[PDB]
């Protein structure tokens, strides 16, 4: 040997001391409460509440607003014989081309 080194320790098994071990901590009470808080908060709170919150987030992307606006424009334009899609985005009168 070239050093005074400790022997490599044996693997420590949580099931030996605690048959009903959740694998969080050595202390049974701390391990049980760690499991309870992780499961409760993560699954219940985050998963369920965040999923339903995201599902019922208000339509701030204006998807339904845009659909209603398009319905109104289509109705007005096809009632008056105008093209449904305008040919130009801007006004050529307000655009001044170089000579």
């Amino acid at each position: 040997i070239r050093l005074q080194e400790d022997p490599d320790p044996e693997d420590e098994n949580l099931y030996e001391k605690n048959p009903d071990s959740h694998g969080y901590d050595k202390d049974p009470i701390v391990d049980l409460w760690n499991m309870r808080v992780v499961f409760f908060f993560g699954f219940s709170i985050v998963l369920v509440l965040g999923s339903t919150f995201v599902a019922y987030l208000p339509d701030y992307r204006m998807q339904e607003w845009a659909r209603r606006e398009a319905e109104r424009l289509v109705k007005y334009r096809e009632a008056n014989g105008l093209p449904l899609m305008e040919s130009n985005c801007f006004d050529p009168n307000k655009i001044q081309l170089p000579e």
């Binding site: 919150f53 019922y56 987030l57 208000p58 701030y60």
Partner: protein, 69 residues
């Protein structure tokens, strides 16, 4: 949800306008400062880059030994 957690679109819109105004003013000021620095260093007619010269209060104007100074 909209009542409790979020505000109306006007707040974000007008805050964005204020932020854009501040940032545009800052960009204009930065470019103008660069131009001013360049001109002042090239010419030397402003308060900046005024490297010292000898003070004329040191000169002795009393008559000397020799008439021609």
């Amino acid at each position: 949800i909209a009542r409790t957690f979020y505000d109306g679109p006007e707040k974000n819109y007008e805050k964005t306008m204020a932020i854009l105004q501040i940032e545009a003013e800052k960009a204009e000021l930065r470019l103008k400062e660069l131009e001013v620095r360049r001109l002042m260093r090239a010419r030397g007619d402003g308060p900046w880059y005024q490297y010292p010269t000898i003070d004329k209060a040191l000169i002795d104007h009393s008559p000397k030994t020799t008439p021609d100074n």
